[PDB]
């Protein structure tokens, strides 16, 4: 069985959270409105009609939750800073209460021996910036994000040594601006009637470009002003499905590779090579922004580590858009691929609660090797891995705690991860389970339970340990 000894000395184990999904206290201590407050309070946007006004109240309950982490022997905790608690209006007046709050959280974690891994941007853009210039659509976001980042380096970098600037820019660009399923909800209305405005063919690429420049601008500030004295490191958490060819044909083998370049490469190729993947330049053409030479020089090498958010593996086949019909540009169409968890009607694996989450442990090992090979062995952290139970009102809490499926999931994915390190020479430095606590799963609301701890929403957010808590405790025992 797995032990700490199955991993390199110093390997970091943690759990992960995000501010909007956990904190609650949305109108407390000067917090400004975000695009997700707006989204959650708009008809049609959240499948279970819920919101995160309270969520799991980690804003007030963080000391309890820190104890729940320590109970397993966790080394670290990934949490995000809500930009709107620091600058309620995105720019302008600093909110001292926001600083005081995250200082309390950081100090409390460190006092328990738990290292903070801090995400600066986990999707909760101040609504003021959405109103001011449509947020990520405007180049101004780059300097505004970088200034916010700098304030965080200044206030917290004496203690915080591990920073994730952005969580899943791919998810944001696609879900926020192509599908319009996540905030701010924008898409080609001809493609999805529920959207109020947007353009699925152009906006995702603009947003992605701005994310890339925003990271680079924050990284330049960090390296020039803070890194020498603070001695920390900066990365990004990329959402990454593994892709296998739907058939053993070179066309589908190439399609799987291309799907990867459009998902991870879209961001990582700029950070490692200074430009977008050639396949994107070829297929997206003039809708794909170009870096200037000075921009490429700040973007290339801007990561200290690669955060990988990984859950699942799909099959990919080559796809041609219908030659007949009016073309409505969108990101999937641009890839020249279709990726699905089915081959000949047979699923690639068992599925968790989430309709997208298929259980394919080997994908973890394949992906680690891919990253090592393509990017010349950068340090990698698994910044998210886990699975969800349903929220089932027809079973007892006691039965809800019996998460043997999650135990098997973590076991199998970690076994693959350990092999990628020991056998394959992949430089993986740590692993964070999604998630500490059941929480608000964005548009899925409270219908999805990802936690190691069960949260009783019908009994003042009481935390109960699922069986996986004991499993992690045993694993991490020293």
Swiss-Prot record:
It catalyses: Hydrolysis of terminal, non-reducing beta-D-glucosyl residues with release of beta-D-glucose. Glycans are attached at residues 248, 319, 329. Disulfide bonds join 187-195. Changing residue 384 to D: Decreases activity toward gibberellin A4 beta-D-glucosyl ester 70-fold. Keywords: Disulfide bond, Glycoprotein, Glycosidase, Hydrolase, Secreted, Signal. Gene3D superfamilies: Glycosidases. The active site is at residues 168, 384. This is Beta-glucosidase 6. It comes from Oryza sativa subsp. japonica. The lineage of its organism: Eukaryota, Viridiplantae, Streptophyta, Embryophyta, Tracheophyta.
């Amino acid at each position: 069985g797995l032990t700490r000894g199955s991993f390199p000395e110093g390997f970091v184990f943690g759990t992960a959270s995000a501010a909007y999904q956990y904190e609650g206290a949305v109108k407390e201590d000067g917090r400004g409105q975000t695009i997700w407050d707006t989204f959650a309070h708009t008809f049609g946007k959240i499948t279970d009609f819920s919101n995160a006004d309270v969520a799991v109240d980690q804003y007030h309950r963080f000391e309890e939750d820190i104890q729940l982490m320590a109970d397993m022997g966790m080394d670290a905790y990934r949490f995000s800073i809500a930009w709107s608690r620091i600058y309620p209006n995105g720019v302008g007046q600093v909110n001292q209460a926001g600083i005081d709050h995250y200082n309390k959280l950081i100090d409390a974690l460190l006092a328990k021996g738990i290292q903070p891994y801090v995400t600066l941007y986990h999707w909760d853009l101040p609504q003021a910036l959405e109103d001011k210039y449509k947020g990520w659509l405007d180049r101004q976001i780059v300097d505004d994000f970088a200034a916010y980042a700098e304030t965080c380096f200044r206030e917290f970098g004496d203690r915080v040594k591990h920073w994730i600037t952005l969580n899943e820019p791919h998810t944001v660009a696609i879900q926020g601006y192509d599908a319009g399923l996540q905030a701010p909800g924008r898409c080609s209305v001809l493609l999805h009637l529920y959207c109020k405005a947007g353009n699925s063919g152009t906006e995702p690429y603009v947003v992605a470009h701005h994310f890339i420049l925003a990271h680079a601008a924050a990284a330049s500030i960090y390296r020039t002003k803070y890194k020498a004295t603070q001695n920390g490191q900066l990365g990004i958490a990329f959402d990454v499905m593994w892709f296998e060819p739907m058939s053993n044909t070179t066309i589908d083998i190439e399609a799987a590779k291309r799907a990867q370049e459009f998902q991870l490469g879209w961001f990582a190729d700029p950070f490692f090579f200074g430009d977008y993947p050639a396949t994107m330049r070829a297929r997206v053409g003039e809708r794909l922004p170009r870096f200037t030479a000075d921009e490429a020089a700040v973007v290339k090498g801007a990561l200290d580590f690669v955060g990988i958010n990984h859950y699942t593996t799909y099959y990919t086949r080559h796809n041609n858009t219908n030659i007949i019909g009016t073309l409505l540009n969108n990101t999937l169409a641009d890839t020249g691929t279709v990726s699905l968890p089915f081959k000949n009607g047979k699923p690639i694996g068992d599925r968790a609660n989430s309709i997208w989450l298929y259980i394919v442990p080997r994908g973890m090992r394949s992906l680690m090797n891919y990253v090592k090979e393509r990017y010349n062995s950068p340090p990698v952290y698994i910044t998210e891995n886990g699975m969800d139970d349903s929220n089932n009102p027809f079973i007892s809490i006691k039965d809800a705690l019996k998460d043997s499926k999650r135990i098997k999931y973590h076991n199998d994915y970690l076994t693959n991860l350990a092999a990628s390190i020991k056998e394959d020479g992949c430089d993986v430095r740590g692993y964070f389970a999604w998630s500490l606590l059941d929480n608000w799963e964005w548009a899925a609301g409270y219908s999805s339970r990802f936690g190691l701890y069960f949260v009783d929403y019908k009994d003042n957010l009481k935390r109960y340990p699922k069986n996986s808590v004991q499993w992690f405790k045993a694993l991490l025992k020293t």
